[PDB]
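Case 156 in the screening queue. Each case pairs one protein sequence with one candidate compound; here the compound is sodium ion. For every case the pipeline is the same: read the inputs, emit a complex structure as tokens, and attach any notable structural observations.

Predict complex for case 156.
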Amino acid sequence: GVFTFEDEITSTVPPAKLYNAMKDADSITPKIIDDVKSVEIVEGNGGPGTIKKLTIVEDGETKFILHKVESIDEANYAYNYSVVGGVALPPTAEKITFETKLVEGPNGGSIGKLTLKYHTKGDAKPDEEELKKGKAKGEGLFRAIEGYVLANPTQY
Ligand code: NA
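Case 156 output:
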């Protein structure tokens, strides 16, 4: 099954800047998110289809996550990736898709829509704590990208 969740967020950063930073997540995330150590491209050019391997630390243990870039829609300031391997995919989970879309907000900032698409095996539903964790991760990454732009104003 596929279960979809949307959350509306705001930023003081305007959407073209955020969107540009989002596309730079491979370099930004290991700097700001303590546990993310590295991002390696396995196949592809950064565009849709690209497979990436993230190396993280959890509890002093090195772990690996696999991502797939799904779609990048500049017209709607949209950047979509999926978690396709590693700890967030328990056996009844197939894939988790994290979509971010931005529009102009009032006061020269942004309104974002964070979509989480939790793909399960067969008739299973998402575990409640897994969903909570997934939403937190999605919002954390958004706030890492935003944090970077707010701390490095000249760069965007
Ligand atoms: Na780090």
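Case 156 observations:
- The first strand starts at residue 2 and ends at 11.
- Strands lie at 2-11, 36-43, 51-58, 61-73, 78-85, 93-104, 110-120.
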